[PDB]
Enzyme design. Structure first.
Site, short mmCIF file in Angstrom:
data_model
loop_
_atom_site.label_atom_id
_atom_site.label_comp_id
_atom_site.label_asym_id
_atom_site.label_seq_id
_atom_site.Cartn_x
_atom_site.Cartn_y
_atom_site.Cartn_z
N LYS A 1 0.82 -1.20 0.00
CA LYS A 1 0.00 0.00 0.00
C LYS A 1 0.85 1.25 0.00
CE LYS A 1 -3.96 -2.36 2.21
NZ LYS A 1 -4.80 -2.54 3.42
N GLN B 1 -5.07 -1.31 9.61
CA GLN B 1 -4.89 -2.60 9.10
C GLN B 1 -5.44 -3.63 10.05
OE1 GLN B 1 -3.91 -2.94 5.97
NE2 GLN B 1 -3.74 -5.23 5.90
N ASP C 1 -10.98 2.63 3.83
CA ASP C 1 -11.47 1.24 3.76
C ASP C 1 -12.97 1.05 3.53
OD1 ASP C 1 -9.32 -0.79 4.02
OD2 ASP C 1 -9.16 -0.04 6.10
N1 L34 Z 1 -8.12 -2.36 7.12
C1 L34 Z 1 -7.81 -3.32 6.22
N2 L34 Z 1 -8.03 -3.07 4.91
C2 L34 Z 1 -7.78 -3.97 3.92
O1 L34 Z 1 -8.06 -3.70 2.63
C3 L34 Z 1 -7.22 -5.27 4.32
C4 L34 Z 1 -6.96 -5.48 5.76
N3 L34 Z 1 -7.26 -4.48 6.67
N4 L34 Z 1 -6.48 -6.67 6.14
C5 L34 Z 1 -6.31 -7.85 5.26
C6 L34 Z 1 -6.97 -7.69 3.87
C7 L34 Z 1 -6.13 -8.41 2.83
N5 L34 Z 1 -5.55 -7.33 2.07
C8 L34 Z 1 -4.66 -7.58 1.00
C9 L34 Z 1 -3.93 -6.58 0.35
C10 L34 Z 1 -3.05 -6.85 -0.68
C11 L34 Z 1 -2.86 -8.16 -1.08
C12 L34 Z 1 -1.87 -8.43 -2.18
O2 L34 Z 1 -1.15 -7.50 -2.53
N6 L34 Z 1 -1.76 -9.65 -2.68
C13 L34 Z 1 -0.77 -10.01 -3.67
C14 L34 Z 1 0.44 -10.58 -2.97
C15 L34 Z 1 0.20 -11.95 -2.36
C16 L34 Z 1 1.25 -12.21 -1.29
O3 L34 Z 1 2.43 -12.39 -1.68
O4 L34 Z 1 0.92 -12.23 -0.08
C17 L34 Z 1 -1.41 -10.90 -4.73
O5 L34 Z 1 -0.91 -10.84 -5.84
O6 L34 Z 1 -2.43 -11.58 -4.54
C18 L34 Z 1 -3.53 -9.19 -0.43
C19 L34 Z 1 -4.41 -8.90 0.60
C20 L34 Z 1 -5.89 -6.13 2.56
O7 L34 Z 1 -5.33 -5.06 2.28
N7 L34 Z 1 -6.79 -6.31 3.52
#
Ligand code: L34
Ligand code: NAD
Ligand code: NAD
Ligand code: L34
Lengths: 292, 292
Positions: free
Chosen positions: A53, A97, A120
């Site tokens: 982020k 988060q 969010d």
């Molecule tokens: N407040 C708040 N807001 C959110 O929007 C989230 C939170 N908490 N907690 C967990 C979830 C999960 N989440 C999130 C964000 C980004 C990715 C992401 O970038 N995934 C990549 C990398 C996978 C890895 O290596 O872990 C992907 O390509 O799927 C996955 C989950 C996220 O940001 N979330």
């Protein structure tokens, strides 16, 4: 052979758009947008997602800070910090988060973030406004999901959608956006939507998914969606994130089987994930422009 | 032969319960509950429904007033009246009968009623809290629908439900209550729920209703639900109200055909209607006890 949609490529598009928007906000004399993220504790996945982020923010020209606190922080202290950030006019977007330590009530914390800074979309007023098809700050993952569908050109109006998962942060908003009226203040998808969850028997899940033009899985169960559950040509959007076995990352979808039967499929990683982060970027500029 | 559920008999039960609750509130030295209803204009159906509400209040021991205003009332004037009633401590429940004249914004009016007095559950905070499965003032018709199901003993957990209609006052809350977790602060039904609406093709409506254990119709279309759309033994709850042809009242359901195929069916009139009024009674005592 399913078209494998790259959420990475889509997210780059969306980030190009945001950068422009931001370069044009600043160009015209306004303050650079600022995103504050509170990260409590030492969860590695939490740290990695926050880092995605803050990098995304830096690439679209948004200032960010990460405020780190130990898991021992009291609820009262975190709320104090939130009040202080709500009341600072340099801060445009504020997110905490999740998850938080057990001793902290997440609903209270989300409802303490100011609605105008709640990038969010977890604050009850943002939730109520979404549920009433009014302009709101939409949650990032659900909006990512709708953007994958809309930017790929996959139709929703009159189509059958199954959503596996009913969580207030992911499943419920996905269902809400997709089913609702395109003619309302915040337009929805006008799809026929089935909500399934932990008490839907597998048998009944299959009998609905087999009618579906789009299936969206947000259950956190590996191989929950297999080829025999999908009609040929269906769009399959995999929101799940599952650590399986070295530790490995997979989605809810049997990708290798389903890519032989679906018209469109998203991989994990590289699908909805990057979209989650890009749409958060979009909400930050929206909070900065004070357009809600 | 379907069991024809009498909403009249159920509503009488619920009204007996409320009368007791009220007789026990007052008995212990608290003020008698007071329900204020604002009725604008000359719509006959509006007048008849408000009259059902004030009679029900009188039979369970709740004081009521009907405040009548002409369709020419400005939005500013109605809002003034609402502020005055919000701020009067004799007034426990406050509802504005809909619909209102075109020149008045209904969303603004509903959001002006104080959440603690919003016995319709239309205020955005009540909507947000419901959508988050928290304690809220539930809207009367949806709660009536859930009470018909629960008091008849019809199971929901793991069952297939189709809801025809997605309106913010009726369809959306019905779907929300029925699909959600029984383990949450406000328990839901744990049913697998399909939301259909004006853009669901009839063909796709039938393919879902035919899997349904419960079908709930809230579309305002006569004969929308016929015998060939229902599986044998299904529960069929008819929320529609349709003036057809002398002028006559029918539901959305072909009652005569469907009563030969369903396990349970509700008539129109005499089904959900009286339940709508009884549950409003329940919300009034809840607002009076200040338990939210
Ligand atoms: N407040 C708040 N807001 C959110 O929007 C989230 C939170 N908490 N907690 C967990 C979830 C999960 N989440 C999130 C964000 C980004 C990715 C992401 O970038 N995934 C990549 C990398 C996978 C890895 O290596 O872990 C992907 O390509 O799927 C996955 C989950 C996220 O940001 N979330
Ligand atoms: N890619 C992304 O950007 C992103 C963002 C947020 C969450 N997620 C992932 O999405 C998944 C769900 O996240 P959440 O926060 O909504 O999680 P959660 O654990 O609260 O929700 C799980 C949901 O799936 C449902 N479920 C459980 N078993 C089921 C079954 N057999 N059939 C249908 N539904 C079932 C539950 O009833 C629940 O509503 C997780 O794998 C999570 O890591 C991904
Ligand atoms: N018995 C009661 O106590 C009670 C209480 C409130 C409303 N109602 C009745 O319920 C019905 C709906 O009321 P509302 O306020 O929700 O009305 P509304 O006109 O806002 O809603 C109609 C809903 O039905 C949907 N619809 C239209 N055509 C459809 C189709 N072919 N298939 C599926 N859905 C379709 C629309 O998309 C919409 O969401 C009306 O007949 C109304 O008089 C009854
Ligand atoms: N604010 C607000 N709250 C509500 O909860 C309603 C509102 N406006 N406007 C219209 C709907 C409809 N509605 C309602 C209430 C009672 C009945 C009812 O008593 N029906 C009876 C009589 C049928 C008849 O003769 O008209 C029945 O047995 O079905 C029908 C609709 C009602 O009260 N509604």
């Amino acid at each position: 052979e399913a078209v494998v949609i790259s959420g990475r490529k889509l997210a780059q598009q969306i980030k190009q758009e945001v950068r422009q928007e931001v370069e044009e906000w600043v160009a015209s004399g306004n303050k650079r947008p600022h995103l504050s993220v509170i990260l409590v504790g030492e969860n590695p996945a939490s740290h990695s997602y926050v880092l995605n982020k803050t990098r995304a923010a830096a690439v679209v020209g948004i200032n960010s800070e990460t405020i780190m606190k130990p898991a021992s922080i009291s609820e009262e202290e975190l709320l104090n910090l939130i009040n202080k950030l709500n009341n600072d006019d340099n801060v445009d977007g504020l997110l905490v988060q999740l998850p938080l330590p057990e001793h902290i009530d997440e609903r209270r914390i989300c409802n303490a973030v100011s609605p105008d800074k709640d990038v969010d979309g977890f604050h009850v007023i943002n939730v109520g406004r979404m549920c009433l098809d009014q302009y709101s700050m939409l949650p990032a993952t659900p909006w990512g999901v709708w953007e994958i569908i809309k930017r790929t050109g996959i139709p929703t109006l009159g189509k059958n959608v199954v959503v596996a998962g009913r969580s207030k942060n992911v499943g419920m908003p996905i269902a809400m956006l997709l089913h609702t009226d395109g003619a309302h203040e915040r337009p929805g998808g006008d799809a026929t939507v089935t909500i399934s969850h932990r008490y839907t028997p597998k048998e009944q899940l299959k009998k609905h998914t087999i009618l579906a033009d789009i299936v969206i899985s947000a259950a956190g169960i590996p191989n929950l969606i297999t080829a025999d559950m999908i009609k040929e040509g269906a769009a399959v959007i995999d929101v799940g994130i599952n650590r399986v076995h070295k530790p490995k990352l997979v989605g809810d979808v049997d990708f290798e089987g389903v890519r032989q039967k679906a018209g469109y499929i998203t991989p994990v990683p590289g699908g909805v994930g990057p979209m989650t982060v890009a749409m958060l970027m979009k909400n930050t500029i929206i909070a900065a422009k004070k357009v809600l």
